[PDB]
């Protein structure tokens, strides 16, 4: 994973996102959704999804939330106050903690001013405390600003490392982007049915065809402009649409 003071930032983009494999994986110790409850994720579409990744203590997962304070949310990683995404977290004691102490996971513990939301700060200047110019030298009136979790496998819970991923769905002003999944049923034939073919809503009997579209045409129309054939998206076969009987 990535440190807590220099988190990563992956910009998920146009694709088919299935937040159900996430939501039901039962391996996550924390799955909170803020802008939007979790089950309705696989039914919405945004412009961009960002995913931020890092590693913290066990009991600092409560500062990854909109409107908190503490050494993590103050100056390591700040979430805006109208967040939209979801926060996921799971314990990772066996991967990140090693006997003798894993001193490779640092965090920032001194900064001049709290972060703006989604702002990032990887500098390593000596936190000049005393009016006396530090001059880049340690000692008194000058602290190094980074400390390290010394993780060890025999730590009580709440001191073992947790890995965190923060998904943030954003909606600029583009034309579209990544969308959830497309729940579909099965296609029946020879029965007056109520059908929807990726947008085409109609009613009628469906029947095997013997016409041949061109391999970019979806549905066919009659003279007087009524839909009378479709192509099944999944199997790509042409089916005629006749009305069911009236008289």
């Amino acid at each position: 994973f990535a440190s807590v003071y220099a988190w990563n930032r992956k910009r998920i983009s146009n694709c088919v996102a299935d937040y159900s494999v996430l939501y039901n994986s039962a391996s996550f110790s924390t799955f909170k959704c803020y802008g939007v409850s979790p089950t309705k994720l696989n039914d919405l579409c945004f412009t961009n999804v960002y995913a931020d990744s890092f590693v913290i203590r066990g009991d600092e997962v409560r500062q990854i939330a909109p409107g908190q304070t503490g050494k993590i949310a103050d100056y390591n990683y700040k979430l805006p106050d109208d967040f939209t995404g979801c926060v996921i977290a799971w314990n990772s004691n066996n991967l990140d903690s090693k006997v003798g102490g894993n001193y490779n996971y640092l965090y920032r513990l001194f900064r001049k001013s709290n972060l703006k939301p989604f702002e990032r700060d990887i500098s390593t200047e000596i936190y000049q405390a005393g009016s006396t110019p530090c001059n880049g030298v340690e000692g008194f009136n000058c602290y190094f600003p980074l400390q390290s979790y010394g993780f060890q496998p025999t730590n009580g819970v709440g001191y073992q490392p947790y890995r965190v991923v923060v998904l943030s769905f954003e909606l600029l002003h583009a034309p579209a982007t990544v969308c959830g999944p497309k729940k579909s049923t099965n296609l029946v034939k020879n029965k007056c049915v109520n059908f929807n073919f990726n947008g085409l809503t109609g009613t009628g009997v469906l029947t095997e065809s013997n016409k041949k579209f061109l391999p970019f045409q979806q549905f066919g129309r009659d003279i007087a402009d009524t839909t009378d054939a479709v192509r099944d998206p999944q199997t790509l076969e042409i089916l005629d649409i006749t009305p069911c009987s009236f008289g």
Partner: antibody
Amino acid sequence: EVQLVESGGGLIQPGGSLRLSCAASGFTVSSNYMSWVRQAPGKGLEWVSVIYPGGSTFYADSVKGRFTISRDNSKNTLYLQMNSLRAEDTAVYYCARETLAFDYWGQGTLVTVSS
Amino acid sequence: DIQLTQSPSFLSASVGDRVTITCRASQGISSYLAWYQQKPGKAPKLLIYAASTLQSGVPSRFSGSGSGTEFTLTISSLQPEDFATYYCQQLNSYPPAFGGGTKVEIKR
């Protein structure tokens, strides 16, 4: 180097109040973790409150609410305005500059007798 | 669950000797705490850093021994002038737990 001195202790009754001034004799109270440590006489210590270089509070368990900390950087003073003392805090108060551990923390008293 | 640290208090010794004080930790803590010297009627002074890296401005008589839990301090070659209590703490976490304190007598 740094010689923190504090003032403001005395005697009062319940529902009273009192401002304590951790006078930062010494430098840069604008950018340091500061805290209040309390002990009743004959007892072990106890932790009260803490200010961040950036402003946050996190009060203790029993003194949750009813108790306020602040700083003043231009005056180099920490301010502890309390009120409604359950008189059960009659204690010896310390203010210490947390520097990755603690140390550098003067002394100062208080009593909250109901008489 | 908060940590409750413990100590075998009320020590008694003579000068120039070895004495050893342990500090229990009734939960899995890592290895970051600190020891203090509390002379009577005064302010504390921390000796052992967040483990054993003794903070500066102290003599060569203290030897903090750290671990996952069951931390232990040891004074070797005593000197008549350490009449006070010694506490444990626990840096890192905001609300921290303190020890119980060990007074140490000086056998005459």
